[PDB]
Amino acid sequence: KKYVCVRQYDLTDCGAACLSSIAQYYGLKMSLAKIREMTGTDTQGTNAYGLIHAAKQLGFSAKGVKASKEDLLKDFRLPAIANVIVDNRLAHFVVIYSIKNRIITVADPGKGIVRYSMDDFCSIWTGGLVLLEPGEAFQKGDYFAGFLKPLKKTVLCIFLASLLYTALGIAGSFYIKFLFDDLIKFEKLNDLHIISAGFAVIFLLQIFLNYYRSILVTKLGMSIDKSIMMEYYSHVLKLPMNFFNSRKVGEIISRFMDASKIRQAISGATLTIMIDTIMAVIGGILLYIQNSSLFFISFIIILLYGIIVTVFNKPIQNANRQIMEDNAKLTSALVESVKGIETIKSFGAEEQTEKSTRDKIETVMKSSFKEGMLYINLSSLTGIVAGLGGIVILWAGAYNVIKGNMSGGQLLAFNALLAYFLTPVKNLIDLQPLIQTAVVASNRLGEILELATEKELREDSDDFVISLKGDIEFRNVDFRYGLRKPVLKNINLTIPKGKTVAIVGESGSGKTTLAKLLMNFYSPEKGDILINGHSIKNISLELIRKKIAFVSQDVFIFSGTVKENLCLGNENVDMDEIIKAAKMANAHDFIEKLPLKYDTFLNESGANLSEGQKQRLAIARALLKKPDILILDEATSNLDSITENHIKDAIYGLEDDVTVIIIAHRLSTIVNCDKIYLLKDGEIVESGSHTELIALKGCYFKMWKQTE
Amino acid sequence: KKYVCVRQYDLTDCGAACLSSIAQYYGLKMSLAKIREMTGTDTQGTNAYGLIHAAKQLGFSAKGVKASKEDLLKDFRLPAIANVIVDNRLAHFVVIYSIKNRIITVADPGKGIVRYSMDDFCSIWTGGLVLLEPGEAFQKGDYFAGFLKPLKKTVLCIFLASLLYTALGIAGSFYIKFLFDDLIKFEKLNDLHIISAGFAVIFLLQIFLNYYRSILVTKLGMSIDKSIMMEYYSHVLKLPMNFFNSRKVGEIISRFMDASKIRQAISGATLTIMIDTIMAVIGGILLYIQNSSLFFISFIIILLYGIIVTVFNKPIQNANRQIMEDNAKLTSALVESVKGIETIKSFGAEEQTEKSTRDKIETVMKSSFKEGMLYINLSSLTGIVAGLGGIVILWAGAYNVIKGNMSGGQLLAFNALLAYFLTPVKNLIDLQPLIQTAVVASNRLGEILELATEKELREDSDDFVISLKGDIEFRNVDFRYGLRKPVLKNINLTIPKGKTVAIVGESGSGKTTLAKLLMNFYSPEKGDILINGHSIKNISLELIRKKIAFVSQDVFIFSGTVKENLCLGNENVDMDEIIKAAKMANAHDFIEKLPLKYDTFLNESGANLSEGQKQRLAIARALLKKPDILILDEATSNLDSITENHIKDAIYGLEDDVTVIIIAHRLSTIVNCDKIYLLKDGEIVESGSHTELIALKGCYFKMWKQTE
Ligand SMILES: Nc1ncnc2c1ncn2[C@@H]1O[C@H](COP(=O)(O)OP(=O)(O)OP(=O)(O)O)[C@@H](O)[C@H]1O
Ligand SMILES: Nc1ncnc2c1ncn2[C@@H]1O[C@H](COP(=O)(O)OP(=O)(O)OP(=O)(O)O)[C@@H](O)[C@H]1O
């Protein structure tokens, strides 16, 4: 056996890095990004419970107990993961491989191979330990193309064009060398004119080849950009709301906009690499035929250039990864700053926002200064190396001329061959900047492959039939958001079928998350939500959100025409149906006074529309969808009595086919209804009808008396 | 005089273009951007009333009457602007300059100048005319540096470095030519080694000079980008919310990010232009000394290159302006699509939101393909011209060698001089892409140069006297948003001083714009808003927003820590005051249960906070500001019973120093208050106290009876 460890790449989430390191220690050479993302890493630091769950799903026999002071154990099972409080800063996760008698081997990825004595061990940490051992499910073993395959003919044509251009250049160089070698002391004017005409024809042929080469390179880049953009965006929509809550808007906006670099750079780099490969293949044979000493000198120069580029390849990513993830932060701050235009001016804090944006610009630009300084230094070093190589080549040519080995035509041919070889040097210089494509590909694939499980695989629906009607119910449902005490602690609730039930409660008493669970926005940990003797986990997710709607309080009016916003979702809608819906939800008398009936272009999100009017419009839009089960969180008319219509028409229009769940902020708005459900401290405290709850004389009656 | 006209650049709003054209016809060389902006151009088209208002404010004596069929008028005052219904498509605006007997000269911006008689003149249009004449308020006359001035030493150093590099190159070329001319067949090994060492030393000096020059340009571009970005953001801050309502968020975000190139290309192009100027200055003298025929050939080649680059110089902007304006629209739609992630998934319409994005990508990429095809074509013709010039130069050199005019060393010197001259050709090729910076500079001066700057221009207060606070009142206030009937028609309202007054109404009855006017968000057209015998137009705008707050219903929680959000605006706040405020607005018992007291990092806008809880937090934040005049819009805790506290503590805590305006959606929540103000159809319909209004038995009583 030998010592092996994996170092740190991220900054805040070192626990996932430690888990990956122990994974490859047991022999799982899997990408750390995907494993880290399905571990469930937190920005502020996931606790040991998430790590235990990640070990369980990986196939480990993990168990978490406070760290034993006696770290000289014998029946112990290595390696181990433990917590440390580094000089009273935070809790960091470290791994220990093999104790012998006295040496504590800690493989901290932060700063390399670490070696503390027990004096430091007793000083740093306080308590924490997870005993991870494989459960034989965690099994050992030494465990893009489609886009290239759709343009095989174009790739072949581009390669043929590059080969033709290289052949034309080689033929022209050979003809020029032969003319110089033979027709030197010729003194012929017509021959010179004919040679000039031939050279002009060769140049015209080269231009003709360059036409097709450049046009097809641009066309290939176009299609590659289209494919990658479309795939990313399609995958970026199909995510659960948890990823949206976790990340900012700008950290998503900036990732998509970075394709402009990769498309152009890859389009250029493919042609450059093909041309360089062809040129090197020709040049190697040409040099081998020509001479050995000149070939040796050229090989030495190429080896020096390759040594330089290999030595300085690593540092480029170290700057690019900072540039990208600081530009992302700049965009994320600026988007939010612009969006809250009303609030920023309302409290008159413009200069503070300006100074914050100045700080963001200053850091994003100080990073760029270094990222350009490295490029300039490398370019200058490469140019100096090229100049030294050219001086050496000139000296060698002079020595050969003095010795009489090579002739003037041979010197010209050697110069042409050296230029052809240095074309690969220019290709290597360009590929030095291909790290700019590598970093953007790795950054954006970081949520393409890792989050792929969240797209549809995590659903695991597998459902035989469709739709629902009846009654909803809960069974031992425990739901938590993470880093917080559970809000849905223990619910035993069965809503009566086809009745107007309502849920009242207090602020922070989970009045919404209860409805959020029904839409399968977040999956519950324990228990299940049953509908007509079924389960949410065993029903198609499309019908789950298609048959039941949800009128969120923060209504989001989508940009475009009114007809599109009303028709969003269920497409192919006749105008008569939406007219009936608007009359049903009081959205027809409103639309009459607008300048263009159902043809007004709404800018941004209801900018030219009143907030109460937008709330009414959202209810109308939901009533278009014809939901069987409806959920209204207050936000009904928001105009005092008028709200009588926008519900009474529904209940009268229901004809007992639908059921309604009213998350009612304002008590006494729900009096003549089937049941009232209070949940406090997670548990369903008291339930019953209005008269029954009033006669009960509990906390419900106390709150009612306090209200009035 | 002579005929002059202006061509159309936009598509939908040609009236602003016609107004600008008639402005230059009367001697106004102002950018059409600002004029088009304060004309009030709509996506569909502004009527004649807005154009008349624009003429009045610009200083043109305009009057709008239906067009006279008898268009042979003699007492008339040309030029004229008239509307036309072009073959029953839309209402376009045209200008007529001079009529002789049977001549109509339509200088249509869309299709240039056309000549028509009355044969078609009566056929096309139906009715409309505006008679614009200079009222002598308009006047005739032929109506960046700081950033360059702060880097004079750096610019001088860069110029000196470029001159040193040019001198080193010239000295090396001259030494090489002299060595070839003198030591052609000397065959001295020591002399060759010494010459190689000297050439290597010269190359090292040139490499050092290029290194220093490159780092100079990099740091100069750094500072230029910093200054320009910082300037733009501040100017994008104090702009009327009108600008925010009119424009999308992406059309603002894409402008700021556009600097990424302008900075880099300008930094490169400054050094390139300086080097090219120095090289051309040297080369002209060198060629004049050398020979005339070679100088004539070089001048002809340079003229051909200039002609070919100038012929296609204008078309590049015609593509870049499309590229930028389409990328802006892509970002504007995609940002909204991402930020409405809840609503998109609520109705499960991810399919449509992908197809629309695919269409946007397709158009923004076809435009890019065209704009790259133009670049490739121009580059290919430039390369072909360069190759032809090189062939001609080789033929001329061969002819001179045959005639015996120039020698081999002279041929090498001529080749070096030709390379130095063609360096300016490469500089011109690079400056061909400087249109990419010119277009973004123009697009962004379309905002920087052309903006309202609400602080500087719209205010015009210049208040030296201390602000006075008391009862508020309205005087003949008429306020409209544009293209709509006025919402604030005619108000004669005087709020009692230091009393709890409330304003109730119906949806679409200006239930907020009335308060929006007080904050001087939009300036009223007629009348004024008086405070303690003063006016809003004659009070400092900072105090107007510092002394009175506004709790918007769409609360915007600003990203960061809770302490920052509470302390936003009024900085330097002691913790005791915010604790008192939170206890005053019920925001302390909330903050206790959170994991970190006043130190929780909020993602996005209240993502990990309850909606209602964020609403309460906004009220607490407003109560920090200690406003003398307060405006609530329901949205007080929204928990019914608890709301009693979050107002009663304020009124008890006010001690009559403050006054409160309650825009109350829910009637019967305001019973024990000073006055109730109903505004209907713009006018104040009925006012009075609760008992007085009940005894009045009007529409107020009818609505009360209908409510319950
Ligand atoms: N991502 C999250 N989503 C929802 N609630 C969260 C989240 N993170 C933390 N929480 C907390 O969990 C609780 C759930 O609040 P919930 O959204 O259910 O309230 P609500 O229905 O808006 O309350 P109210 O009675 O004021 O109307 C709150 O205390 C909230 O601050
Ligand atoms: N920029 C704008 N600001 C406000 N209203 C606008 C604007 N543009 C158009 N409108 C329209 O003008 C009318 C004025 O509405 P206003 O904003 O005064 O109502 P509100 O007080 O917000 O409404 P409510 O009390 O019913 O919720 C509405 O029909 C609104 O849609």
Side-chain angles (χ1 to χ4, degrees), chain A residues 245 481-482 484 487 505-514 516 522 553 633 663 665, chain B residues 590 593-594 607-613 616 637-638:
Chain A
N245 283 333
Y481 280 91
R484 174 160 298 87
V487 298
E506 311 305 8
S507 179
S509 184
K511 300 197 53 49
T512 54
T513 186
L514 190 61
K516 281 247 191 172
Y522 315 106
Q553 298 193 184
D633 302 8
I663 297 169
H665 294 194
Chain B
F590 176 73
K593 304 181 300 303
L594 273 298
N608 75 252
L609 208 40
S610 167
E611 30 219 39
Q613 294 172 340
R616 281 132 48 77
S637 304
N638 290 178

Side-chain angles (χ1 to χ4, degrees), chain A residues 590 607-613, chain B residues 245 481 484 487 506-513 522 665:
Chain A
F590 177 73
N608 58 331
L609 183 63
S610 160
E611 50 195 359
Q613 295 172 341
Chain B
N245 281 329
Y481 284 96
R484 174 170 287 79
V487 298
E506 315 303 344
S507 178
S509 180
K511 290 305 303 69
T512 58
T513 185
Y522 313 130
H665 294 83

Side-chain angles (χ1 to χ4, degrees), chain A residues 233 248-249 257 336-337 339 342-343 345 358 365 521 545 559 564 603-604 611 665, chain B residues 222 226 233 237 245 248-249 331 336-337 339 342 345 354 357 545 553 559 604 638:
Chain A
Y233 187 103
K248 320 180 87 74
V249 287
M257 202 96 68
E336 279 185 355
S337 179
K339 287 307 303 289
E342 180 183 4
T343 298
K345 283 151 52 50
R358 185 162 283 157
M365 182 179 72
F521 278 121
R545 278 193 283 286
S559 73
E564 180 174 4
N603 189 359
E604 278 291 331
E611 50 195 359
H665 294 194
Chain B
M222 171 274 258
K226 205 268 192 203
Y233 187 81
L237 177 63
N245 281 329
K248 320 186 87 72
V249 294
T331 295
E336 279 184 353
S337 179
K339 289 197 45 59
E342 171 53 33
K345 281 149 53 50
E354 182 179 0
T357 300
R545 291 208 203 68
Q553 298 193 4
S559 71
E604 279 292 330
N638 290 178

Side-chain angles (χ1 to χ4, degrees), chain A residues 360-363 365 370 372:
Chain A
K360 299 299 212 311
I361 293 162
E362 190 154 39
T363 178
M365 182 179 72
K370 315 194 150 33

